[PDB]
């Protein structure tokens, strides 16, 4: 009416096995979760570093703008003074400024590429976790069902301990 099993030693043996499997699967999930957290922390660090490149590039481009507006006047002056010496220095100095920007831009690009790869890793870590979770929960439940069965059967706590530990 009340619809909802072999010997005790054989159920107890399976309790030891399933518990070992639960502890092994738990430690695996713990490993991935350490990676999940570390990678999450690294990703924000990289994202903040990208903002730091963006901000550094911004100030360089202000320098470029400032160089254009500001130079304008002095370039005109030593033109009507055959001081093409100084014009040449100002322009060459400005060409060095532009060149350094290209190095900074390239560096920012290299990091964007790394953050893209690590973003893929984050998602892979999160995928593997989600394929481990059902094994983990199922193994927890099975372990608990075996204990309950043995406990109902009147099996002593010391015998249950040695199967779990």
């Amino acid at each position: 009416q009340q619809d909802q099993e072999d010997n005790i030693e054989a159920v107890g043996k399976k309790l030891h096995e399933y518990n070992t499997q639960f502890q092994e699967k738990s430690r695996e999930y713990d490993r991935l979760y350490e990676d999940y957290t570390r990678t999450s922390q690294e990703i924000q660090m990289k994202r903040t570093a990208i903002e730091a490149f963006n901000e550094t590039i911004k100030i360089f481009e202000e320098q470029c703008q400032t160089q254009e507006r500001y130079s304008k006047e002095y370039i005109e002056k030593f033109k009507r003074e055959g001081n093409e010496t100084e014009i040449q220095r100002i322009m060459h100095n400005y060409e060095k400024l532009k060149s350094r920007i290209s190095e900074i831009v390239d560096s920012r690009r290299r990091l964007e590429e790394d953050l893209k790869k690590q973003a893929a890793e984050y998602r892979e870590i999160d995928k593997r976790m989600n394929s481990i979770k059902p094994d983990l929960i199922q193994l927890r439940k099975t372990r608990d069902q075996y204990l309950m069965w043995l406990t109902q059967k009147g099996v002593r706590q010391k015998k249950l301990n040695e199967w779990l530990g």
């Binding site: 999450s40 990703i43 730091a52 550094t56 400032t66 130079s71 400005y94 350094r100 989600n130 927890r140």
Partner: protein
Amino acid sequence: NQSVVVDFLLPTGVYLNFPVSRNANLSTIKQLLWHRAQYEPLFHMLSGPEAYVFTCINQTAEQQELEDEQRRLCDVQPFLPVLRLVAREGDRVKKLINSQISLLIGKGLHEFDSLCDPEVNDFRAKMCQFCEEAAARRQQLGWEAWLQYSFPLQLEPSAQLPNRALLVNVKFEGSEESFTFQVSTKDVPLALMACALRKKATVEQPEDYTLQVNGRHEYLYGSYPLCQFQYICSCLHSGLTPHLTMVHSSSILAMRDESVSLWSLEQPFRIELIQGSKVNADERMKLVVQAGLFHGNEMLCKTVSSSEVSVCSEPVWKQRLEFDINICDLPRMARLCFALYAVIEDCPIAWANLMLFDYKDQLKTGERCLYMWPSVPDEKGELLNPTGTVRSNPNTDSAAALLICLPEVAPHPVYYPALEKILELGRHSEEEQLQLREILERELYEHEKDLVWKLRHEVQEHFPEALARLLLVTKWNKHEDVAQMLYLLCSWPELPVLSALELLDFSFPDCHVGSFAIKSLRKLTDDELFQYLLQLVQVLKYESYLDCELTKFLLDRALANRKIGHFLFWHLRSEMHVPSVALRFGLILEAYCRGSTHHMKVLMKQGEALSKLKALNDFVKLSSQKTPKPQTKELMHLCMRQEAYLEALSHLQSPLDPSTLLAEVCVEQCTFMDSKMKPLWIMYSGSVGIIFKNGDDLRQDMLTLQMIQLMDVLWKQEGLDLRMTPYGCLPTGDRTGLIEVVLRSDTIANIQLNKDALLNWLKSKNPGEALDRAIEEFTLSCAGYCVATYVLGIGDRHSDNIMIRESGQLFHIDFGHFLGNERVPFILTYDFVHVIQQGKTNNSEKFERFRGYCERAYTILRRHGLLFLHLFALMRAAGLPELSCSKDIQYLKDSLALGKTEEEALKHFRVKFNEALRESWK
């Protein structure tokens, strides 16, 4: 290496590039810059060096004006070595503070702006204003009051007793000439000051002075006898002469200076489940979204589920999910909770929660993109996760998410009704007293709950301490009932501290409840509030909104008391790496800092010390794996002796106790252990030390130690001093913290090398007449720690993790496990019993004295058992592995036997005691 190539951007547009030394200060670098700039175009148009300030992009991606030109480039840590010359313009004070805050709190202040969030913006605007204002008031106050803010009295638990005449060393500020003279333990500090002057007058008023414990920022003042001050109490027991210095008030001033209604809308609650994004699931399976409304623990109505759409990264539903509750019924703190599942035609993927009303009480409408948090598989295994935070995941670029849309309810915007409207609706509405008495006086059942609701007015009149019970019976999914409960709550009598602590639990989410709780917590003294500071901080993780009462309360007390502010700072700072609290804590720290510009300086120094230690520790780790300890130890020392390191590790206030000055590092005395995590042992020159650990979470140890400290206080409050050693322990960062070294001590293992070694060691350290003291110190402390460890369920207790001091005091360290992690029996150790009994087989007089100490200790903790349960209940917030659930709390109920009577419990403790004594030989 040494040199680094630095880009220089001049205000004329000119660009320079040259090597500078990494450890060179900015002032020096300006000189090198100017010297080279003269040989480059457009020089003559520049103003002098001093008319400009360098600017860099710092580690947190913010622009920073580098006003302190005595700072070294390596310490400045710019993102790239790029320095820009700009004018000394604008409110540089505001600019300087804003940049320091960002460096100090972890998170760049710009990160708050980047969110584009009114709630964030309103918090910052309102809280920074209040904190700045408090600061300005404080500056106007007198040197006495400012001293009280800055260095509040450290008094023994006697306050908030015999008489003896004992010597004190007194000198003045500037003069080497000290004076030794006798004054009584019951003399106030003003009287001792008067004596020192009368001595000076032989060779200024006594009220124009205060007394400092020289070497320390700990001061003796106020209407209290000398023996109630911790410093004197400590000296009295030790028999040492206290050394004081009298400081003039001026010297204290010097350091001071430098429309539609809600109840009308009877429409059932619904949402549009549009889409999910960035799901990482099993392609073979299908995807389901589970939803449910919540108010604290309780469901408001039944849950509802989506259709089984196939597993892809970007799933689409477009369903209406309708819930079994009307909009007019939704409580203020109504919480809509989602969980994404992967089912095979059952893995919990991720979850996310959302408040239905916003911070201004407005019922939300329109689209919403909830960036989800991944589901942790745990024992409980619930469908949804209502206890989880409401804040969205800050990893917006990579994290899975659900796009939802709250529908338009009305053409105008609708708010949750104002208090006046609540009290209007809430106004209208021998035999029975028997059933209610039984229920309260002593988890309720449906029959009982409806009685309590019926007799809710009787609860308010005759059982005011039962408020918590009455709040849990209230049906928060019916707006009529909610109004009636809130009506009572507004007239409810003030409850004691202990009750208020219960009401801060997540079971009581309503903002009026929190408000009533805090209102009862305002009678807290700073000393007592300090005992619960850690718990109060963890309760912030349960709050719905950024602007709350608890945050205001904490900032208030942090602004009035610099010790509270210190530790508030470090509790929040130590969790800034944690995504779910970084925003909330970031904002509180910002506001704290603006009201506390003096302490910011202290905390900056500490933060820099701690960042060098992290680097120092990482260098040791990489060295230890290659080379052996002696060689690594010396390499540690060389790395420490560098100017940037030495200066940053030297001359700071200790994070463990801001009154302790860590002055000169003793590099030769510094070392580490080749163990797990390679902790560093750092000594200072009154020869304090600290342990720096990086690798483990220390939060559990601090909790344990805080509870032992609370025990000590509770015992000390009823005449019992069990001579404990509750040493400082402070988490500072991501798996990082400090431990206060206890000097003149060793581990039992090391001392044990008949084995009458403990008593011999004691004999060697307390020769002749000192030994009876040492044994008594051992007895009192062994009792205290036997009970503490029994009650908290601390196992793994062995010779390595138990230490003894040269005074005779025993104490425990490294509390990795508690609350059973099975019932831990009460434990008596043969070797300790031997020492207690003065090395004799039988000493009945002494051993019974020891047994009484244990029993009295245990009896006192039972009296305050509800306090321990409540404090532990709030620590569930912290997510400590070994404090997850009701079963962990239940451990304390049983250890303290709170369902048993006082006599019954003590008779069971006796049986456990006796059986531990029997087990001692076996």
